[PDB]
Amino acid sequence: NLSSARSRIQDADYATEVSNMSKAQILQQAGTSVLAQANQVPQTVLSLL
Amino acid sequence: NLSSARSRIQDADYATEVSNMSKAQILQQAGTSVLAQANQVPQTVLSLL
Questions:
Q1: Distance (Å, whole) CA B33 – CA B43
Q2: Count of C-beta atoms within a 10 Å radius of residue B20
Q3: Is the CA virtual torsion A15, A16, A17, A21 positive or negative?
Q4: Which residues are CB-contacts of A18 (< 8 A; sequence separation ≥ 6)?
Q5: Rounded to a whole number, what is the distance in Å from the CA of B34 to chain A's nearest CA?
Q6: Chain A residues touching B49 at Cβ < 8 A
Q7: b or e along B40-49 (b: 16 or more beta carbons within 10 Å of the residue's beta carbon)?
Q8: In angstroms, rounded to a whole number, what is the distance separating the alpha carbons of residues B19 and B13?
Q9: Min Cα separation B9/chain A (Å)
């Protein structure tokens, strides 16, 4: 019973953790892509001179 | 008569404990198998990664 009680507050719900890991990977790739497109925002300025 | 009384109080009627032996053996095999399946219960975690 005490081992189960320790588990209830200690170990990881691997379904939820895997879901969070996949979600965080999606956010990482989306963030680096949107940051890449953010870096060329001032390039439009470097057209008129 | 006293040997009879000692038989009633001390000796074991083999039918009962033979039945108990059979029940215990079947319980042993069933418990080993159930423990086995409990051991592969967490293998389902190694399906999502």
A1: 16
A2: 10
A3: positive
A4: B48, B49
A5: 19
A6: 18
A7: eeeeeeeeee
A8: 11
A9: 40
